[PDB]
Structure 1
Amino acid sequence: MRPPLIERYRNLLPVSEKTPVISLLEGSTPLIPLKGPEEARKKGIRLYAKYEGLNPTGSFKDRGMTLAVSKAVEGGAQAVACASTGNTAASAAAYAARAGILAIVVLPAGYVALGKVAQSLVHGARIVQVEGNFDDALRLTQKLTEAFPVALVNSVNPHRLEGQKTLAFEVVDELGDAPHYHALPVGNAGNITAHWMGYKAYHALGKAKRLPRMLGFQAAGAAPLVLGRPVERPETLATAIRIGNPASWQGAVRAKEESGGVIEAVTDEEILFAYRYLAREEGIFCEPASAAAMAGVFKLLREGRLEPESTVVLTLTGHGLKDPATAERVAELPPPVPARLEAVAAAAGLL
């Protein structure tokens, strides 16, 4: 029996008997141990993939949305709103539907994967596509929630992060201690901040004896945290993190500093390589943005900056089905052949 995330960690969340539990049964995702890569195995470095693509709406956002929406409804909210590169919008839409309230999502025109758009569509969210990027959308949405009785459910809402910190809890619960390293993508920066919050809380509770080094990775075309200043024209095929001015900037920096980790850039080429590696070699399909976490691991490995005899946990943020269009970038679909055995056997390379 898979429990609502809010119930699994009720004692560690800002809820009470008065809180309406709006759950689609999120969290408690699998922690898949990885075979390699060989580059890691030879150094006594093993990897685990926290597969967040198996959350109800396909991404880790559900962890924060369940709490955010539940608390909003508790406060009487009739509607919720959020700007998004796709996943937060899909999550807000699904939970709003579950709760029976209105969901308004603002998206950057042309920079949202088809899977995500399809989700906001089908779940019935009121969609607004703006002729601008995510950063513009976020600025606009916050102003919208200041002029109308609509609950803002973007990461700036504390409940989003309190809910997402549970990912750290689950890793420790399963492994018995926090890992030496925890890698994940960084877009608006709420997740890296939530992970660290989770690890610190569990360490204070004594459930984790050690504190992991947080390894955050941004796409080279949208790496404000890496360059040290906002990026006016963020660019990258991993549109989930096509973000130039992260709202949790300070949270990310502190997480990096406090944990002794890093926040670095990986190229779109490196993202595609890791993306293909996970799917073709480990049998795990995550969207490009998520693959950035693995790309980061590959990077530090090749540079000898990951200590031997360590456990590395990767947070694969979203399922690959979120963005099917990118598959054609790492593989080719063979043209159709006649429905005759001969043609099939040849096409299958069995002749």
Structure 2
Amino acid sequence: ETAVKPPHRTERRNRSNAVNPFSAKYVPFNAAPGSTESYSLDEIVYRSRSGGLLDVEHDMEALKRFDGAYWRDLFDSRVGKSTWPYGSGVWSKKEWVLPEIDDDDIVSAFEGNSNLFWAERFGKQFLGMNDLWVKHCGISHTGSFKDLGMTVLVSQVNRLRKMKRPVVGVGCASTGDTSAALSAYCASAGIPSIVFLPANKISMAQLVQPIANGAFVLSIDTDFDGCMKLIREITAELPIYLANSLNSLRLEGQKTAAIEILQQFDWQVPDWVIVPGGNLGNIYAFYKGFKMCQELGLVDRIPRMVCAQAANANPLYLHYKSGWKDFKPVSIDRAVYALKKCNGIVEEATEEELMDAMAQADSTGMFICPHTGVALTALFKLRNQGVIAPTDRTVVVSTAHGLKFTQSKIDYHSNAIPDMACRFSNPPVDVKADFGAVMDVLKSYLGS
């Protein structure tokens, strides 16, 4: 009869058999015109001879043997898939991510294929826009965009681990989303995850995910400097890979959110993509994904972008208003490089201004993170300057689920935040247990 599958399972590559044409390597970020320096992804590598960032470079020549149409159709034939690799919004674009990993080593939770919402009501009643979308990277297994990166990173690591290569585990020194996504993926695969922290930076609340995921969290008696000293001293005496902010392998998974944005728009290029970004790699990552789609010819243009920044966070904005003539190569260089290439813009949000944009977006039905506030603030501003027209297809990237920011909204709505009006707050309304009284609170609210 209807053979569903063979009793036992565990689990189509765009390439010549018994000989995979694609490959990638580590190269220095935006290296010289004629440079040879490289590293295998199999090497545990963090900087480049000069102490500079690394960037994963894919063999563009291999990929190009196959035309634009080839790749749109290949990627499109994997939408809706339930198979070991293809499910993931990252692995479905494996060839352009980690072309050489065996599917047996991938560590996926089916990240990607992220909600691309249409802010009909917010666009209209607030910006006069009819084609504003929000890309919910936060609606994932972890609560953030960081799952795109960790899937790749943990895959690469699981690969080195299974090759009898030496990697006993993964280390980290973060109390946020990276630590959460990193501990998650590692746990699914059975790879130890170690978090290193000064004891004065422990918060059961902030570490709920790694703790829940089985991470070995060290609460160390020293400050951050002394904690970094140990990490460095440990990793050098134990093959433990540190997942660092600067890791370029995470960028290979994050770049898929851009490809996906194009995919979801049935390969049409948006006029503007706003990337929030306390973390400067997020925007380069998007740029890399949009650039790659174009290099390979899946589309003809790359979208203009916005690096929306929180007030006084970094000097990125100061640099932009003065056409970067005071710039010199938090990793700004990748942001700058990326904004140059796409003729981008950088814009700001005050602390009060992001909370208000959040209340406005939230009143429209969304339940967003501070960074989307910054993004939307950037948008409300760029709109007044006539830089973003009303009919302009704009996508705002949301990197973390709103459920991670409740305490922020609570404080706001109950007018409990210092230095801020909290003008759009909606606290509950007090009323006597009297019929008529209640009919009044109601009659007005609503109207007549």
TM-score of Structure 1 vs Structure 2, range by shorter chain: 0.7 to 0.9
- Structure that is richer in helix per residue: 1
Larger radius of gyration: 2
Equivalent position amino acid for 2:123 in 1? P
2:246 aligned residue? 156
The equivalent position to 1:295 in structure 2, one of 368, 372, 377, is 377
Match of 1:127? Answer: 217
Q: Distance in 2 between matches of 1:85 and 1:146?
A: 22
1:242 is matched with: none
Q: 1:348 to 1:24 in 2, by over 3 A?
A: farther
Q: TM-score, normalised by structure 1?
A: 0.81
Aligned to 2:189: 99
Q: CA deviation at 1:304?
A: 2.7
TM-score (norm 2): 0.65
Q: 1:4 aligns with which of 54, 69, 88?
A: 88
Q: Name the residue aligned to 2:140.
A: 55
- Corresponding position of 1:25: 110
Match of 2:164 in 1: none
Aligned positions of 1:241-252 closer than 5 A? 246=330, 248-252=331-335
More divergent stretch after superposition (327-336 vs 309-318): 327-336
- Deviation (angstroms), 1:323: 2.0
Change (3 A) 1:306 1:143: farther
CA distance in 1, matches of 2:254, 2:124: 31
Q: Which stretch of the first structure deviates more once superposed, 7-16 or 271-280? A: 7-16
Letter in 1 for 2:301: R
What is the rounded CA distance, in whole Å, between the counterparts of 1:18 and 1:201 in structure 2? 23
Give aligned pairs, total.
328
Q: Which residue pairs with 2:315 in the alignment?
A: 224
Matched, 1:66 2:148: no
Structure 1: which 5+ residue stretches go unaligned?
Answer: 230-245
Instruction: Verify the 8 A CA contact 1:45 1:308 in the aligned structure 2.
Output: yes
Instruction: Report if the CA contact (8 A) 1:291-1:316 is conserved.
Output: no
Q: CA distance change for structure 1 residues 277 and 129 in 2, over 3 Å: closer, same or farther?
A: farther
Counterparts of residues 219-298 of structure 1 (less than 5 Å): 219-228=310-319, 246=330, 248-281=331-364, 283-298=365-380
Post-superposition shift, 1:254?
0.6
Give the partner amino acid of 1:59: S
Alignment deviations for residues 256-300 of structure 1 (CA, whole Å, 9 cap, x no partner): 11111122321111110121122211x221221232211211121
Q: CA deviation at 1:91?
A: 0.4
Structure-2 separation of matches of 1:90 and 1:22? 15
Match of 1:170 in 2: 260
Question: Does the CA-based 8 Å contact 2:124-2:130 persist in structure 1?
Answer: no
Q: CA deviation at 1:153?
A: 2.2
Equivalent pair of 1:213/1:259 in contact (CA under 8 Å): yes
On the 8 A contact 1:155/1:161 being kept in 2, the answer is: no
Alignment-mate amino acid for residue 83 of structure 1: A
Give the CA deviation at 1:67.
Answer: 0.5
Report the 3-state secondary structure (helix = DSSP H, G, I; strand = E; otherwise coil) of the residue aligned with 1:182: strand
Pick closer, same or farther for the CA change 1:94–1:249 going to 2, 3 Å. Answer: same
Higher RCO (CA 8 Å, separation ≥ 6 residues): 1
RMSD: 3.4
| Change beyond 3 A, Cα 1:335–1:34 | closer
Deviates more, 1:103-112 or 1:264-273: 103-112
Tell me, yes or no, if the aligned pair for 2:372 and 2:396 is still in contact at 8 Å: no
Structure 1 position 129, deviation (Å): 6.2
Any gaps of 5 or more consecutive residues in structure 2?
1-79, 162-166, 321-329, 415-426, 444-448
Residue number in structure 2 paired with 1:16: 100
Q: Tell me, what secondary structure is at the counterpart of 1:318?
A: coil
C-alpha deviation, 1:147, in angstroms: 4.9
Corresponding residue of 1:80: 170
- For 1:177 and 1:146, locate their aligned partners in 2 and report how far apart those are by CA, in whole Å: 47
Deviation at 1:330, TM superposition (A): 2.9
The alignment-based identity, stated in percent, is: 33
The match for 1:238 is none
Moved more, 97-106 or 10-19: 10-19
Partner of 2:51: none
